[model samples]
Target: HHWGYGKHNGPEHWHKDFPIAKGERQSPVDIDTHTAKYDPSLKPLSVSYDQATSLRILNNGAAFNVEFDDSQDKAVLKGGPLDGTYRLIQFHFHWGSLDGQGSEHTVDKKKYAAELHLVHWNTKYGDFGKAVQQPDGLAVLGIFLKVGSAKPGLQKVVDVLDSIKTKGKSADFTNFDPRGLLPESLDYWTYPGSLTHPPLLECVTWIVLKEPISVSSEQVLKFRKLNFNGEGEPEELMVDNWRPAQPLKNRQIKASFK
Candidate 1:
């Protein structure tokens, strides 16, 4: 109903509402892998999520997200470009209408079938609201999803899509561990960027994985089943929910490995 991926109120027109959309350190920057510097100081990321922290799943007009119990440090992400412990708030995925053009961040101009973002807020900032206002407030773990064999973790998530096909629909989705969705390699590239979604706050420390997880074509079709409109509204499939790659400005991408 508001700013979405469609042309009417897409990324292009977002700056009219969210002025920060044109600011420095915007997100989803295309990673020219060749130019990324290898930073020996960047340590391996630490992701420890208590399996029970996953609370529920919802379709909030944008994309489906599995919300977590972030009141405590149950699910945390640190190191690998983060200075302090950040609690997991929610995790969501971005996709497209076609398999060849869903991902937000591209590698050498290559787009993947999808992209996943695990959103976290710094604990030192007291709360998510305050942290989100700071430059180092949030940290997002971005992972590319390519079309291939089915991923065991994705199957669990896809199974629940049937119950949340309409915008604003939600369901109890517990017992899920965020770690289960992780790729084998922790190698990553780090940068400073904003949230790809609206408000586009420049508070995230972008840590994107070098290796992509696989998602079967059937699994992706399930994602398309989601509707941007709420129940009884005109039918509109939820697809192409990605913000195009933004400017790199003077930012440097630091890689965890050479």
Candidate 2:
């Protein structure tokens, strides 16, 4: 149900005219039956922050996005913690009109309350564009969210959200550890996948987290209030701004644990 619940809340309206919008692999389903493919031997190195972290806030007044430029060159793994050397590009989130919706990475086809994507690049492969062609060029850490009575780490970035909740805008966020966005447990499912958006680039090593964060029902509603290029603007309200799902394309899914 794209926006089956409401006029502007379905996939039909959001992905309008966007061909790739209706592709398969589309997440947020009711089914939940996927086997675990674990590789305990392979651990992701913890991403380290550069001595100097650069941050930028983007907003059009409707929603807010934070970009962390040139943070980590690589991340590597150590005892108890994994570390890797990768460039910190940016981090953003996706949500729905209601708490039961939103989120890009679904579990067993089950849609979480919402989802967050902290995007990083493998400088070893090349620039983002070129890396988009390589299998391990892109590494996205995914965290799920559900509406509840408990608070989560989103407080780490909520300031930026507060600064840009108006219609058609963005803002600048600083002095924040992008790593704070990640969940406590790094246990994740890795898959050879593609970008969930346009260009439909099939060049990503998806790290879908097994655990999800909890947020208040109000925080969930705060996100629903965001309106991007809507009406007179360049886009519409970001009520359900998520990609419909992509094809698996004969690719095998991997995981940190089996």
Candidate 3:
């Protein structure tokens, strides 16, 4: 059974196999800044990345993920509603077919060009596999991408798309500092939510940055060029891979800045 962004198996139909899709704390919610409560108690988020931890990049049919070694605290995220250190395990992106909109999380009902996810796991629970099964075990930093000037450090990651253009393909990607891809402003809106992807586990603490980074139109098109099919399989363009904004329900988005 294939779970993908399609009319039959898309997010709308995910609840058929994963009932948690209708969970109380689902992700990629529309962030109405007007209603977001500002909290002075929230600490500034601290991020530290080790370029040496950059291992390889793979196109996993769904999206391209840049994997890292999480055994050590080489790349970690702390503070900001977090009580313990969360090690960065991987990062990936979701984009649309065209340039108008593609971001998963919206601000005031406004969607951006794309979105990036830096996935981390709480070290208190040991490895990512164990942590993902528990509440308060995972933290994902979401950064929005807008179409504009070219982004410097991001081009390095984009350049490798040619090699790993098909699904199940991977290549050596070293010395790449993921931090360079972050926006200047760390101010964020956070809330409890499930992974946007299935099993849709409600174990994530989402920290979505308020500011967006810029990427050229040409650069974003490169994402669409990557194939969602395996070698010798029918070609499929990977686009509009983001999940729709789920209902806010009773959850409140807490702001780190006023």
Best by lDDT: 3
Scored against the true structure, residue 252 in model 1 reaches a CA lDDT of: 96
- The CA lDDT of each predicted structure is 0.91, 0.59, 0.92
Cα error of candidate 2 at position 204, Å: 0.7
* Candidate 1 Cα misplacement greater than 4 A, ranges: none
Arranged by lDDT, best first? 3, 1, 2
Candidate 1 to truth, TM: 0.98
**Each prediction's TM-score versus the true structure:** 0.98, 0.75, 0.98
Give the clash count for each candidate.
0, 45, 0
List model 2 lDDT by residue over 128-210, tens digit each.
66777665666776789877755545665654555555554455566766555556777766665666654455556566777
Off by over 4 Å in 2: 1-34, 49-54, 60-63, 71-84, 149-152, 166-168, 230-236
**lDDT of candidate model 1 versus the reference:** 0.91
Off by over 4 Å in 3: 50-52
